[PDB]
C-alpha cells in the first residue's frame, strides 16, 4: 500500500473492521471488508481477500499479486586351486556387497482421499475441520455436501488453535488457506507440522484488493501492480515476510 499511494498520489487513512471477518452474505447482506465496500462506507479494502466468482459480482478485484489456494496440513592339487579361486570370487562378491552397502548408506492421495470422502468410515475414526464463515468453507459446501457436513463438529476458531490441537493430537488434519499455512510450516517450533505432498494446491486463484463498484481507479490501480512484477519488488518483499526456516 505504501508503494501504491506513491505513484497514483492518493491520500488515505486506515481503520479496523468490527463486524465480520472476511465477508459473508447473510440474508443477502455482506459484512466484513466486502460488506463495507458494498455500503461504500470505505472505498478500498486491503488484506487477505480470496478471489472467487461469488465475491466478484458485488465488488471489483484488481489483478492478484500473490498466488494461493486451499490446502490441508497434518503433523509429520587342481581341485584345491579351484577351491582357492572360488574363495577369491566369494571375497570379491563379499567386497561388492560391503562397498554397495556403504554406498546405499551414504545415499494421503489428496482431498479426494478415501478417508476424506469416507470420513470416520474406517476402523480408525479420522478427524478434520476448518474455521467457519470463510471462503474455504463456502467452497467445500458447494462441491462436497456430505464432506462439508462431516466437518461441522471439528470447526476451529484460529490458526494457533488448530496448530496446537494438531500438536496435542486432538485433531488429525486441518484445512485452511494455502498461503498462510505455508508461512506457519516454515515458522513452527521445529518442523513437526507439514502440508500434504511437496506442496499441492486445489482450485488455484489469487489474493485481491476490494474496490468500490465500477471505480475509475481500477485502470490505474492494477497497472501499478504489473509494474511491480516487471521490476521485481515482490521477491525482496516476500523474502522479508514470507520466508521460512524449515525445508
Amino acid at each position: 500500500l505504501k508503494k501504491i499511494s506513491k505513484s497514483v498520489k492518493f491520500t488515505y487513512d486506515l481503520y479496523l473492521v468490527t463486524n465480520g471477518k472476511h465477508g459473508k452474505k447473510i440474508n443477502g447482506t455482506w459484512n466484513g471488508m466486502i460488506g463495507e465496500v458494498v455500503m461504500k462506507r470505505a472505498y478500498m479494502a486491503v488484506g487477505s481477500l480470496t478471489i472467487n466468482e461469488e465475491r466478484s459480482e458485488v465488488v471489483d478485484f484488481s489483478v492478484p499479486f500473490i498466488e494461493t489456494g486451499i490446502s490441508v496440513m497434518v503433523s509429520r592339487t587342481t581341485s584345491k586351486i579351484m577351491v582357492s579361486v572360488w574363495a577369491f570370487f566369494a571375497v570379491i562378491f563379499l567386497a561388492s556387497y560391503t562397498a554397495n552397502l556403504a554406498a546405499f548408506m551414504i545415499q494421503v492421495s489428496g482431498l479426494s482421499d478415501k478417508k476424506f470422502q469416507r470420513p470416520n468410515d474406517f476402523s480408525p475414526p479420522f478427524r478434520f475441520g476448518t474455521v467457519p464463515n470463510g471462503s474455504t468453507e463456502r467452497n467445500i459446501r458447494n462441491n462436497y455436501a456430505e464432506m462439508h457436513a462431516y466437518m461441522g463438529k471439528f470447526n476451529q476458531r484460529g490458526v494457533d488453535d488448530a496448530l496446537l490441537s494438531l500438536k496435542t493430537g486432538k485433531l488429525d488434519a486441518f484445512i485452511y488457506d494455502a498461503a498462510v499455512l505455508n508461512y506457519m510450516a516454515g515458522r513452527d517450533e521445529g518442523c513437526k507440522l507439514v502440508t500434504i505432498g511437496s506442496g499441492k494446491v486445489f482450485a488455484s486463484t489469487g489474493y485481491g484488493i476490494a474496490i468500490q463498484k465500477d471505480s475509475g481507479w481500477k485502470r490505474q490501480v492494477d497497472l501499478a501492480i504489473l509494474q511491480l512484477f516487471g521490476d521485481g519488488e515482490m521477491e525482496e518483499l516476500e523474502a522479508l515476510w514470507l520466508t521460512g526456516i524449515c525445508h
Binding site: 478471489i51 486463484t205 516487471g230
Partner: protein, 212 residues
C-alpha cells in the same frame, strides 16, 4: 508491431487464444482476462622360526586386504540458473539462445543489466522452440531460456532433456482480446469458473500431467 499483435490490431483477427505472455506493453494496446497458466522461466539442458614369520605375514595379508576394501569402498562411494558467472560473461563455448522476436528477448532487453546477454543471444536467436530443441539435441546448443511447462513436457518426452534450478519471473498465460468489449466480462468469469473446479485437472490429465 507484427506477429499475433500485428494481426490482431490489423482487424484480421478477433481474439488471440495462445500461451500469451502477459507483460506491460501488451496491456496498454490490448486487453486480457484472468491468466489460465502459472509458471516462470528456466533453462533446458542436455544430459618353527618360519611359523612366526608366517603368522606375521598372515596379519600383513589381512591388513592389506582390509586396506584394499577401504580404498575400493572410497572409490565406489565418494550453471545453476542465471547466477552462473560463466553466463554473466559468456564465450563461444556456453551457447544459450532464445526465440527471435519473442517476449523473453524484450523482457531481457528491459533490464539493461543483462546487456551482454542481450549482446550474445542476438547472434543465435532461433525462429521456433522446435529449432532450438533440435539443435540442442544435436548438442549444437548448451542452454535455452524458455517457459517451465513446455520444457517439462519436453523432458518427459525426451529423457536427456534436463532443467535447471532457478524459477524466476512468475507470470502467467492468458487470453488476448480486442479493446473494451462485452466479450471480456463473461470470458473472464468463464475462465475463473473453469479454474475453480476440476476441469483444469482433467485437461492436465489429457496433456500436462502425462509423462513419456
Amino acid at each position: 508491431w507484427n506477429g499475433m499483435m500485428g494481426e490482431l490490431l490489423s482487424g484480421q483477427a478477433d481474439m488471440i487464444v495462445a500461451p500469451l505472455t502477459i507483460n506491460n506493453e501488451r496491456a496498454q494496446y490490448i486487453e486480457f482476462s484472468k491468466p489460465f497458466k502459472y509458471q516462470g522461466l528456466t533453462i533446458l539442458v542436455k544430459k618353527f622360526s618360519a611359523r612366526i614369520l608366517g603368522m606375521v605375514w598372515a596379519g600383513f595379508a589381512m591388513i592389506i586386504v582390509a586396506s584394499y576394501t577401504a580404498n575400493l569402498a572410497a572409490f565406489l562411494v565418494l550453471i545453476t540458473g542465471i547466477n552462473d558467472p560463466r553466463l554473466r560473461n559468456p564465450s563461444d563455448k556456453f551457447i544459450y539462445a532464445t526465440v527471435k522476436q519473442s517476449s523473453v528477448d524484450i523482457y531481457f532487453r528491459r533490464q539493461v543489466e543483462l546487456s551482454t546477454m542481450y549482446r550474445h543471444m542476438e547472434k543465435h536467436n532461433y525462429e521456433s522452440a522446435a529449432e532450438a530443441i533440435q539443435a540442442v539435441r544435436d548438442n549444437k546448443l548448451h542452454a535455452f531460456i524458455w517457459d517451465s511447462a513446455v520444457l517439462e513436457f519436453e523432458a518427459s518426452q525426451k529423457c536427456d532433456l534436463v532443467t535447471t534450478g532457478e524459477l524466476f519471473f512468475r507470470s502467467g498465460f492468458g487470453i488476448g482480446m480486442r479493446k473494451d468489449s462485452p466479450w471480456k466480462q463473461n470470458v473472464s468469469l468463464s475462465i475463473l469458473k473453469s479454474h475453480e473446479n476440476g476441469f483444469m485437472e482433467d485437461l492436465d490429465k489429457t496433456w500436462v500431467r502425462y509423462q513419456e
